[PDB]
């Protein structure tokens, strides 16, 4: 935008509803992903929110080892699309497709 | 930083929200784990948290054997990615890959 303030006026494109409290955007995105699971199957689409889930987790030496496992799992799945900080190179060595 | 006080004021980056109490963060890493075990099923990222699981343990005659073998074991997976205090040469005989 430009100067202290500067909306257009196509404003209002959510609407109001209520729901359980979360301290952050984080939290939510994580708990809405576990209860994606269970009322799903032992199929395939169940990998990828398991996953999901371990990349939602935040610091620790535990939680790292996983969720960067997790990363790499998803994007040579080719589904995540790499953020590209590094994972680009994720992608690289991906990109070969058993190449060898 | 520079002389005995030097913090810049891009400091507030955490909020606060409360949880178990734990005596340090190795503790809490270590419960972290746990917790995400049997809430997977035994496929294979099972593996990884049961191995992270020994990792975690602190000193001992039985944790170290097993310790370490887990570490190797996460390190010729490729996930663990090495510390290097010696985990190098662990690397090494893990990258000849098949070579025999």
């Known amino acids: 935008e430009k100067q202290?303030?500067?909306d257009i006026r196509g404003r209002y494109?959510?609407?109001?509803?209520?729901?359980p409290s979360?301290?952050?955007?984080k939290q939510q995105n994580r708990a809405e992903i576990l209860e994606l699971l269970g009322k799903t199957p032992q199929g395939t689409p169940e990998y990828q929110l398991?996953?999901?889930?371990?990349?939602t987790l935040l610091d620790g030496k535990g939680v790292e080892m996983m969720r960067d496992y997790?990363?790499?799992?998803?994007?040579q799945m080719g589904v995540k699309?790499?953020?590209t900080p590094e994972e680009q190179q994720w992608l690289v060595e991906?990109?070969?497709?058993?190449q060898g």
Chains 1, 2 share one sequence.
């Open 94 to 98: 991906a990109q070969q497709a058993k």
């Open 4 to 6: 202290v303030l500067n």
């Open 13 to 19: 494109e959510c609407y109001t509803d209520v729901g």
């Open 81 to 83: 699309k790499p953020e």
């Open 22 to 25: 979360f301290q952050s955007m």
């Open 70 to 75: 997790a990363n790499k799992q998803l994007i």
């Open 50 to 55: 398991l996953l999901l889930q371990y990349f």
